[PDB]
Amino acid sequence: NALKSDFDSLRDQITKAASNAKFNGVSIADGTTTKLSFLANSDGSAFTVTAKTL
Amino acid sequence: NALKSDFDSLRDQITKAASNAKFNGVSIADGTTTKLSFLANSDGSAFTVTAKTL
């Protein structure tokens, strides 16, 4: 049960560390969105970046 | 009787040491409070530390 409590503290600290990762309110790895569509060229074409949930 | 007297002296020093473990007026081990809390991030989420009375 001591190793169980260790495993639980590890797993929920991972939830904390993943949830707190964001820049100006958006995150590529929180799983809130499937992608972010960053600008690429003057005509409006975007540099797609697929999200990787952590 | 000598052994029970040393036994009482031991259990009394245990009460002393358990009651003297305090930091800036707060203790996680004294048993005065069910838990203690600390900041996790900028928005005010807590990092709870469950008390373990000694």
CSV table of C-alpha atoms in Angstrom, one decimal:
chain,number,residue,atom,x,y,z
A,1,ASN,CA,0.0,0.0,0.0
A,2,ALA,CA,3.0,2.3,0.4
A,3,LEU,CA,4.0,1.7,-3.2
A,4,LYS,CA,0.3,2.3,-4.1
A,5,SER,CA,0.3,5.7,-2.5
A,6,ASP,CA,3.6,6.5,-4.3
A,7,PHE,CA,2.0,5.5,-7.6
A,8,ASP,CA,-1.0,7.7,-6.9
A,9,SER,CA,1.0,10.8,-6.0
A,10,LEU,CA,2.9,10.3,-9.2
A,11,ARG,CA,-0.1,9.8,-11.4
A,12,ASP,CA,-1.9,12.9,-10.1
A,13,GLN,CA,1.2,15.1,-10.2
A,14,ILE,CA,1.2,14.2,-13.9
A,15,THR,CA,-2.3,15.6,-14.1
A,16,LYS,CA,-1.1,18.8,-12.5
A,17,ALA,CA,1.9,19.2,-14.7
A,18,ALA,CA,-0.1,18.5,-17.8
A,19,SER,CA,-3.0,20.8,-16.9
A,20,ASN,CA,-0.7,23.8,-16.1
A,21,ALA,CA,1.0,23.7,-19.5
A,22,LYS,CA,-0.4,26.5,-21.6
A,23,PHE,CA,0.7,29.8,-23.3
A,24,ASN,CA,-1.5,32.8,-23.3
A,25,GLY,CA,-4.5,30.6,-22.5
A,26,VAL,CA,-4.0,27.9,-25.2
A,27,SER,CA,-2.1,24.6,-25.1
A,28,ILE,CA,-0.9,22.2,-27.8
A,29,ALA,CA,-0.7,19.4,-25.3
A,30,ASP,CA,-3.5,19.8,-22.8
A,31,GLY,CA,-5.9,17.9,-25.1
A,32,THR,CA,-8.4,20.8,-25.2
A,33,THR,CA,-8.1,21.1,-28.9
A,34,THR,CA,-7.0,18.9,-31.8
A,35,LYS,CA,-4.6,21.4,-33.4
A,36,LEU,CA,-3.4,25.0,-33.5
A,37,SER,CA,-3.4,26.8,-36.9
A,38,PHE,CA,-0.3,29.1,-36.9
A,39,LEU,CA,0.3,31.5,-39.7
A,40,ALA,CA,2.6,30.5,-42.5
A,41,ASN,CA,2.4,32.9,-45.5
A,42,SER,CA,1.0,36.3,-46.4
A,43,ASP,CA,-2.1,34.9,-48.2
A,44,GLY,CA,-3.4,33.3,-45.0
A,45,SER,CA,-2.2,29.8,-45.4
A,46,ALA,CA,-1.5,28.3,-42.0
A,47,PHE,CA,1.2,26.1,-40.5
A,48,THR,CA,-0.8,23.3,-39.0
A,49,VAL,CA,0.5,21.7,-35.8
A,50,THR,CA,-1.3,18.6,-34.6
A,51,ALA,CA,-1.9,18.5,-30.9
A,52,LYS,CA,-0.3,15.8,-28.8
A,53,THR,CA,-2.2,15.2,-25.6
A,54,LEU,CA,-0.1,14.6,-22.5
B,1,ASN,CA,8.2,-1.8,38.7
B,2,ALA,CA,11.5,-0.4,37.4
B,3,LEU,CA,10.7,-1.6,33.8
B,4,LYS,CA,7.2,-0.1,34.0
B,5,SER,CA,8.7,3.2,35.3
B,6,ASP,CA,11.2,3.4,32.4
B,7,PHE,CA,8.2,2.5,30.1
B,8,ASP,CA,6.3,5.5,31.5
B,9,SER,CA,9.3,7.8,31.1
B,10,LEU,CA,9.6,6.7,27.5
B,11,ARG,CA,5.9,7.3,26.6
B,12,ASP,CA,6.2,10.7,28.3
B,13,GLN,CA,9.2,11.8,26.3
B,14,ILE,CA,7.2,10.6,23.2
B,15,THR,CA,4.4,13.0,24.2
B,16,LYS,CA,7.0,15.8,24.6
B,17,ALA,CA,8.7,15.2,21.2
B,18,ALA,CA,5.4,14.8,19.4
B,19,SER,CA,4.1,18.0,20.8
B,20,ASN,CA,7.3,20.0,20.2
B,21,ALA,CA,7.4,19.5,16.4
B,22,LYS,CA,6.1,22.9,15.1
B,23,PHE,CA,7.2,25.3,12.4
B,24,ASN,CA,6.1,29.0,12.5
B,25,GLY,CA,3.0,28.0,14.5
B,26,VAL,CA,1.9,25.2,12.3
B,27,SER,CA,2.5,21.4,12.5
B,28,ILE,CA,1.5,18.5,10.2
B,29,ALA,CA,2.3,15.9,12.8
B,30,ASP,CA,0.9,17.4,16.1
B,31,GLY,CA,-2.6,16.4,15.2
B,32,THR,CA,-4.1,19.9,15.8
B,33,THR,CA,-5.5,19.9,12.2
B,34,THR,CA,-6.8,17.4,9.7
B,35,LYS,CA,-4.6,18.6,6.8
B,36,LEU,CA,-2.4,21.4,5.5
B,37,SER,CA,-2.5,23.1,2.2
B,38,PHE,CA,0.0,24.9,-0.1
B,39,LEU,CA,0.0,26.7,-3.4
B,40,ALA,CA,0.3,24.6,-6.6
B,41,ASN,CA,0.1,27.3,-9.3
B,42,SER,CA,-0.8,30.9,-10.1
B,43,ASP,CA,-4.6,30.4,-10.1
B,44,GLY,CA,-4.7,29.3,-6.5
B,45,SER,CA,-5.0,25.5,-6.7
B,46,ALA,CA,-3.9,23.7,-3.5
B,47,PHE,CA,-1.3,21.0,-2.9
B,48,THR,CA,-3.0,19.2,0.0
B,49,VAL,CA,-0.8,17.3,2.6
B,50,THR,CA,-2.8,15.0,4.8
B,51,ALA,CA,-1.9,15.1,8.4
B,52,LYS,CA,-0.3,12.1,10.0
B,53,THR,CA,-0.7,12.5,13.8
B,54,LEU,CA,2.3,11.2,15.8
